[PDB]
Amino acid sequence: FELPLPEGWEEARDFDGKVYYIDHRNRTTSWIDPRDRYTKPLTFADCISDELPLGWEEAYDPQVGDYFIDHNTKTTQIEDPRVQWRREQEHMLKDYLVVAQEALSAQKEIYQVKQQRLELAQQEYQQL
């Protein structure tokens, strides 16, 4: 025994045989099984290990080969989005490391400007 479609929903098949879901209450359709929202991780962060988050699909096409479908953003891509996500997380920490280095470097300059201003205030003052 499986789990029922939530109230108002129906399952159907597109011309190519791909299953889709019909929400009669809101008069829309979706490639995403409405029961997935109770099971699947919502973001790549919540995934373990190889799982795809909600609204992502593997697909294939003879022209392009294996690719990925994101029903969340209504885009398709070649690159594995799980790989891409791990890469994005490292790049962000790298970026934060780099702006910390630049912030430190610029404050060193400010500090040195301030000690130059102290010297000038000393000169002006010792002119009495």
Binding site: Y20, Y21, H24, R27, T29, W31, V64, T76
Partner: peptide
Amino acid sequence: RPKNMTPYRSPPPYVPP
């Protein structure tokens, strides 16, 4: 992505019972 990249296919239009 390639130049012949498969574009996003939206789900079929809503249709009553």
